[PDB]
């Protein structure tokens, strides 16, 4: 066991191993607070997240377990990963706090797109890295479900990592089937989000800046058109099908006119991501092979993930049992090779 030390940062107590020095508050990001720090063992700048109230309710205890299980499984250059996870507790009896450690990332995609316009070459590289991480995530049967610019961490090398995967105006990046509350949406919802992000990087403008869920769907249908007969056959909900058919029909717009002046390969890919029928949307693996990424695509360096057991999601357990399971996962953590 290492030696811990205690301090207060922004009305919050931080107790960390002495290997982490020079903690500076970076902001209350996520179900937790984040501090930048200097890792004396490696010489690298790290981000340390302290979870808030991790075992206060069954909801929190399960979510804490879910996030730790998820972060421990991900080992990919374009997905946020765990350098370390620790607790100051010496036993389960006094186990009450969980701290997570990853490499410090300088900014998010929202900070970049707002502060500067991006050339087509940067768009290629950024979207390529999103899709490469997504191929990995999806191969483990994990859906992100909330991809957006602020969940994409980026540093000055333009290296990118996906944050907050698999966890839990209205969402401008959410797939339309979600706005319609379809309960059997699948991993292609993330491809829709990537299309919206890509469009924004190319134009500098939010593609679908809806004011609420109804307006969000309206804006979407204005660009991609109202559902065709093939898609209508797949809608079981009677209220939804009746609503969709009651709308005045909208034609699909030509993306080459909407994104005039963009690389026509970029436009072709957007067409393939922003398809209304989720069954016809391009997958992450397929998108990586698209000619738009010809200068980065390497089929021998686009790996998939090990199998990921999500069976715990269907279990009904006590707080103390979720806490014990989380404790087990803290103690069994093995840091990645230096
Ligand atoms: C709109 N917000 C979108 C979310 C965002 C954010 C940044 C960070 C973050 C990540 C990396 N380098 C700086 C900040 C984190 C975060 C921090 C530490 C971690 C340690 C282990 C595992 C995961 C971790 C996630 N989590 N969330 C804040 C802004
Ligand atoms: F997600 C949904 C669910 C139901 C509806 C709906 N069905 N019939 C009428 C509506 C409707 C129309 C306008 N604003 C809200 C709801 C619209 C969207
Ligand atoms: F208006 C729309 C917009 C999107 C969809 C849709 N796209 N992919 C899957 C669906 C879908 C939506 C609701 N129920 C089943 C399937 C269906 C109707």
UniProtKB/Swiss-Prot annotation:
Cofactors, names only: Mg(2+)
Outcome when changing residue 312 to S: Emulation of the active state. Increase in activity
Chain positions found as Phosphothreonine: 12, 248
Entry's EC annotation: 2.7.11.24
Modification(s) after translation: Dual phosphorylation can also be mediated by TAB1-mediated autophosphorylation. TCR engagement in T-cells also leads to Tyr-308 phosphorylation by ZAP70. Dephosphorylated and inactivated by DUPS1, DUSP10 and DUSP16. PPM1D also mediates dephosphorylation and inactivation of MAPK14.
Mechanisms controlling activity: Activated by cell stresses such as DNA damage, heat shock, osmotic shock, anisomycin and sodium arsenite, as well as pro-inflammatory stimuli such as bacterial lipopolysaccharide (LPS) and interleukin-1.
A single GO cellular-component term on record: extracellular region
Name recorded for this polypeptide: Mitogen-activated protein kinase 14
Classification of source organism: Eukaryota, Metazoa, Chordata, Craniata, Vertebrata
């Amino acid at each position: 066991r290492p030696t811990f030390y205690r301090q207060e940062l922004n009305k919050t107590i931080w107790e960390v191993p002495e290997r982490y020095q020079n903690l500076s508050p970076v902001g209350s990001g996520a179900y937790g607070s984040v501090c930048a720090a200097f890792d004396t063992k490696t010489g690298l700048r790290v981000a340390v997240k302290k979870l808030s109230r991790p075992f206060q309710s069954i909801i929190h205890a399960k979510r804490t377990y879910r996030e730790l299980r998820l972060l421990k499984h991900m080992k990919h250059e374009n997905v946020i990963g765990l350098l370390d996870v620790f607790t100051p507790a010496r036993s389960l009896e006094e186990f009450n706090d969980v701290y997570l450690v990853t490499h410090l990332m300088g900014a998010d995609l929202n900070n970049i797109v707002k502060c500067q316009k991006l050339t087509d070459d940067h768009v290629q590289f950024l979207i390529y890295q999103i899709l490469r991480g997504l191929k990995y995530i999806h191969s483990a049967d994990i859906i992100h479900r909330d991809l957006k610019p602020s969940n994409l961490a980026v540093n000055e090398d333009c290296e990118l990592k996906i944050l907050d995967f698999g966890l839990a105006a209205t969402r401008w990046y959410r797939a339309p089937e979600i706005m319609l509350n379809w309960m059997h949406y699948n991993q292609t919802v993330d491809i829709w989000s990537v299309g919206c992000i890509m469009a924004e990087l190319l134009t500098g403008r939010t593609l679908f800046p809806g004011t609420d869920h109804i307006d969000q769907l309206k804006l979407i249908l204005r660009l991609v058109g109202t559902p065709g007969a093939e898609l209508l056959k797949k809608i079981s909900s009677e209220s939804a099908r009746n609503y969709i058919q009651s709308l005045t029909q909208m034609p699909k717009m030509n993306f080459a006119n909407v994104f005039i002046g963009a690389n026509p390969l970029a436009v072709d890919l957007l067409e393939k991501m922003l398809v209304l029928d989720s069954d016809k949307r391009i997958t992450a693996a397929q998108a990586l092979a698209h000619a738009y990424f010809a200068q980065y695509h390497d089929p021998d360096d686009e790996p998939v993930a090990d199998p990921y057991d999500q069976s715990f999601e269907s279990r009904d357990l006590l707080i103390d049992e979720w806490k014990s399971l989380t404790y087990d996962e803290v103690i069994s953590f093995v840091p990645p090779p230096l």
